[PDB]
């Protein structure tokens, strides 16, 4: 039965008191320094974000006052001998009251207070990074003691010295000689001294915040040298620094063949740029260096996959000021905003590829034979139908009604197709030479219906999964043949009975089709593409057969030879019919590893040539 202990018999009689929520700071500091950030290296990223926020606040205050703008930059100092790292900025700075209010209070951020005093939410809201109030305390992950020398930008503010050992207690004092801005001294821990090295600090800074809006100097050397080109207008930015930005983000030295600059705000604020490499994709590729940004700082999700898996051949950067973030400055897993951003990016990239195909046939064709497998994988892995047709609009195939060297899409293929026809025919062969001479094409050559020729692998599976385009079905040539509704009748009956006797285990059914002229034999099955690809699966890996039907050509000379050669050499006749079956299986693509057929072919060749 049901055993429930929930009851409503309880009642309230006592006076209702009132209390304010408390928060002990010892455990909060312990949580921030130990169980908040997975990476120990994010503390300088947080400090650089704080410096950028301070510089932005100073810039906003100065432009509000409308006076001269002094130099503003972020300086990083590394001292291996002292085991310390120093970050200094020329921002607004903090008074003693400001230092106590901000530094001494957990989750209290002056950035949010400054943003609440903007009244426009566009001048600096897009550039202020701080939103939680725990970014500074990430520095206690590596520092046994922190010295902060901050002097406010107000004309007359005094410098102040800030000490904190990270043990829940901090002290402040008056400081003399402190320049305008904020100077932070970090004394590294015994086990975290790797941050007192120039190389590691430079690498991690370039990883996190090399796109900080203000100049950044480490040990006196600036390493930015490159503005965030995804913020500026596409017309302002030129192709030369597009190439430079591509060479930096993709860690390559080639040029991007395609450059898409996406900047929309109505659905959600996106400032993203995408590139397509000139060189063919490497097998390593087969977050794809499209790591998400927010207010010009790295997020390194690698789990939400802001960009579709098949769209991993493109390189670039995506920026969004409204993405939700963890307390550790990481994306919220399985967030609705993330999913809608991914969908919008995929739709925009599909539209951009369609436009590129429309405006450049030859360049897009080269791109397709360079990156077709990615679109094939996207069609295979897709679930929504409209996504399937959107990706299929990017497919390029060459039909039988056109000369070699030019390719066409499914849309313009169906545009020129007859009104009565309501299905699309496609044939699969390694080359167009084989496709034109393929027995299935010859069998279907009776009608004038156009047929597409696809050569690359996984085309069978891609077309099978698509299964529809513009309300038109995709039927393979073999499927059309199987669903379709000199060797006299008696000798032909006896001869197919011969195959049925000698190929009963392999060939389940033998029949004669009058639609063959050059190929002596044909193998047709209902699930031709599915069976062909599943056989490749099975032979590739032993994991979790089929119903083959062989059709002979009555008018073929090779088949006609069996009539006179059966009575002379029964064994040679059996070997020849076995070889014919193997050749038909190979042509159908349903054959297994053909190393076994080699011995039979050699034996047949040596045995059947004792006449010259």
């Amino acid at each position: 039965p049901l055993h429930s202990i929930i009851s409503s018999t309880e009642s309230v009689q006592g006076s209702t008191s009132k209390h304010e929520f408390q928060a002990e700071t010892k455990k909060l500091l312990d949580i921030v320094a130990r169980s908040l950030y997975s990476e120990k290296e994010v503390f300088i990223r947080e400090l650089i974000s704080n410096a950028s926020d301070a510089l932005e606040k100073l810039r906003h205050k100065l432009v509000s006052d409308g006076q001269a703008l002094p130099e503003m930059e972020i300086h990083l100092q590394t001292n291996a001998e002292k085991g310390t790292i120093t970050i200094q900025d020329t921002g607004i700075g903090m008074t003693q009251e400001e230092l106590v209010s901000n530094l001494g209070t957990i989750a209290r951020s002056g950035s949010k207070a400054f943003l609440d005093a903007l009244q426009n939410q566009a001048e600096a809201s897009s550039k202020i990074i701080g939103q939680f109030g725990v970014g500074f305390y990430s520095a206690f992950m590596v520092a046994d003691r922190v010295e902060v020398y901050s002097r406010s930008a107000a004309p007359g503010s005094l410098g102040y010295q800030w000490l904190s050992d990270g043990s829940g207690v901090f002290e402040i004092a008056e400081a003399s000689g402190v320049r305008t801005g904020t100077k932070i001294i970090i004394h590294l821990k015994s086990d975290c001294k790797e941050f007192s090295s120039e190389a590691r600090v430079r690498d991690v800074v370039t990883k996190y915040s090399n796109f900080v809006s203000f100049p950044l100097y480490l040990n006196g050397r600036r390493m930015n040298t490159l503005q965030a080109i995804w913020m500026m207008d596409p017309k302002d930015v030129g192709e030369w620094q597009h190439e430079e930005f591509y060479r930096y983000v993709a860690q390559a030295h080639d040029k991007p063949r395609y450059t898409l600059h996406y900047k929309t705000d109505a659905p959600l604020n996106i400032r993203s740029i995408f590139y397509v490499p000139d060189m063919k994709p490497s097998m390593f590729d087969v977050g794809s260096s499209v790591a998400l940004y927010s207010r010009k700082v790295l997020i390194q999700t690698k789990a939400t996959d802001i960009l579709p898996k098949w769209l991993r051949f493109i390189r670039g950067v995506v920026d969004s000021e409204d993405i939700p973030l963890n307390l550790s400055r990481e994306l919220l897993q399985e967030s609705a905003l993330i999913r809608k951003l991914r969908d919008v990016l995929q739709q925009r990239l599909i539209k951009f590829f369609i436009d590129q195909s429309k405006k450049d046939a030859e360049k897009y064709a080269k791109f397709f034979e360079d990156y077709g497998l990615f679109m094939r994988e996207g069609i295979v892995t897709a679930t929504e139908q409209e996504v399937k047709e959107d990706i299929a609009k990017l497919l390029r195939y060459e039909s039988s009604a056109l000369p070699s060297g030019q390719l066409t899409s499914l849309s313009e293929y169906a545009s020129r197709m007859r009104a009565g026809t309501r299905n699309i025919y496609y044939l699969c062969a390694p080359n167009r030479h084989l496709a034109e001479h393929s027995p299935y094409y010859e069998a279907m050559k009776k009608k004038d219906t156009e047929v597409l020729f696809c050569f690359e692998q996984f085309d069978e599976l891609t077309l099978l999964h698509l299964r529809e385009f513009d309300k038109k079905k995709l039927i393979s040539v073999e499927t059309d043949i199987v669903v379709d509704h000199c060797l006299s009748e008696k000798e032909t009956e006896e001869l197919m009975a011969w195959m049925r006797n000698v190929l009963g285990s392999r060939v389940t059914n033998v029949k004669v089709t009058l639609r063959l002229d050059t190929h002596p034999a044909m193998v047709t099955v209902l699930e031709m593409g599915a069976a062909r690809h599943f056989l490749r699966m099975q032979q590739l890996a032993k994991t979790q057969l089929l119903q083959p039907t062989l059709e002979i050509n009555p008018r073929h000379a090779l088949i006609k030879k069996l009539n006179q050669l059966r009575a002379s050499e029964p064994g040679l006749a059996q070997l020849l019919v076995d070889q014919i079956y193997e050749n038909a299986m190979i042509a159908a693509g349903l054959v297994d590893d053909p190393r076994a057929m080699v011995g039979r072919l050699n034996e047949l060749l040596v045995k059947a040539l004792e006449r010259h």
């Binding site: 060479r247 860690q251 390559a252 030295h253 080639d254 490497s282 097998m283 390593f284 087969v286 898996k309 098949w310 994988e377 295979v380 892995t381 996984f458 599976l461 099978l464 999964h465 299964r467 699930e527 593409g529 599915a530 690809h533 599943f534 699966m537």
Partner: protein, 121 residues
């Protein structure tokens, strides 16, 4: 003075933005072994150790010293170095045979391929 010009193919997977590029190496033939493998070892210990090659017995028994020269696959520890000053040796790896041995193919999205099979069957 017999300076030999060697044009050795180089590709470092760990290099940032490495692309196929051509380099020329000059080694004196008066102080180097006649065999091709000796020149490769000479630059490894003296000129540049970046180039990696496999050699065990420097005699022609293990086969680790086999690469392609002048579009022809040969053996470095058996075939000697050409003495022509004007002619430059074309030191290439095996015809293509790139880092595929260490590319570690993933072959992902394999279940989705099966998921597209059973609706037809």
């Amino acid at each position: 003075p017999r300076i030999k010009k060697f044009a050795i193919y180089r590709w470092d997977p760990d290099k940032a933005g490495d692309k196929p590029h051509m380099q020329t190496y000059e080694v004196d033939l008066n102080k180097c072994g006649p065999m091709v493998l000796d020149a490769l070892i000479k630059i490894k210990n003296e000129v540049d150790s970046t180039l990696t090659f496999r050699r065990s017995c420097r005699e022609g028994i293990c086969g680790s010293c086999a690469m392609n020269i002048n579009g022809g696959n040969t053996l470095a520890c058996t075939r000697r170095i050409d003495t022509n000053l004007n002619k430059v040796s074309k030191i290439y790896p095996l015809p293509h045979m790139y880092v595929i041995k260490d590319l570690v193919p993933d072959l992902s999205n394999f279940y989705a391929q099966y998921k597209s099979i059973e609706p037809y069957l």
